[PDB]
Ligand binder design. Structure first.
Ligand SMILES: NC(=O)C1=CN([C@@H]2O[C@H](COP(=O)(O)OP(=O)(O)OC[C@H]3O[C@@H](n4cnc5c(N)ncnc54)[C@@H](OP(=O)(O)O)[C@@H]3O)[C@@H](O)[C@H]2O)C=CC1
Ligand SMILES: Nc1nc(N)c2cc(CNc3cc(Cl)ccc3Cl)cnc2n1
Length: 186
């Protein structure tokens, strides 16, 4: 199995969600970036795995579910089987990560992408090990009810460049944003 990664878009006030929707209006090229990054597998004959909480799964329009080209795993201790259209269900992140080492998945998964929400990010980010954060910085405040956890810059280094990631300021719908990559290894 390849790298472990979080990817998020987050406003200045650390906001990632409001009422099961994004706090800002649709940013089309930001969506394209999310798709490109989670879908592109560096290893032939493999797909990337996406891991997400139950509320993140249901936040995705039904037509966009499952995230296509990727293996879709949902985290839930209430659900007794994967949601309609999902591929796998786990009861914890450790369980999810453990499953990728099983007969069924060992050979099939390239990179793993944690794509939400708050508590799954939090746990991933404070788990020892080699981890990257792909963070799109939406450079305005937006009313939110769900937030990205604190990024501890003593551990997470902001990378000065990354292949495939634009370094300059982007702008869609009057909303400025920029792509960042962080890395820890501990
Ligand atoms: N801006 C961005 O990049 C992103 C924004 N979002 C947004 O955030 C919101 C959804 O996020 P959030 O509310 O944080 O919810 P989550 O997607 O994390 O879902 C939380 C639920 O998933 C289960 N769960 C979460 N973590 C675990 C775990 N470790 N083990 C087992 N089950 C777990 C739940 O189910 P149960 O009660 O069934 O056990 C728990 O109640 C929406 O607004 C969405 O639009 C989401 C991703 C990215
Ligand atoms: N950078 C970044 N990181 C994430 N985790 C994101 C996650 C989402 C999830 N939402 C969503 C997904 C699909 Cl495919 C279609 C419609 C919606 Cl609303 C949206 N944008 C994201 N951007």
């Amino acid at each position: 199995v390849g790298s472990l990664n979080c990817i998020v878009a987050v406003s200045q006030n650390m906001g990632i969600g409001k009422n099961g929707d994004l706090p800002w209006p649709p940013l089309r090229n930001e969506f394209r970036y999310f798709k490109r990054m989670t879908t592109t597998s560096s290893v032939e004959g493999k797909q990337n795995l996406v891991i997400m909480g139950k509320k993140t799964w249901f936040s995705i329009p039904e037509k966009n579910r499952p995230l296509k080209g990727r293996i879709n795993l949902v985290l839930s201790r209430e659900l007794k089987e994967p949601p309609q259209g999902a591929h796998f269900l786990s009861r914890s992140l450790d369980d999810a990560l453990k499953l990728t080492e099983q007969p069924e998945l060992a050979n099939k998964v390239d990179m793993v992408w944690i794509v939400g929400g708050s508590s799954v990010y939090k746990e991933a980010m404070n788990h020892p090990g080699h981890l990257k954060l792909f963070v799109t910085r939406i450079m305005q405040d937006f009313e939110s009810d769900t937030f990205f956890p604190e990024i501890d810059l003593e551990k997470y280094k902001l990378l000065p460049e990354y292949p495939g990631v634009l370094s300059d300021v982007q702008e869609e719908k009057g909303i400025k944003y920029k792509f960042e990559v962080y890395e820890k290894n501990d």
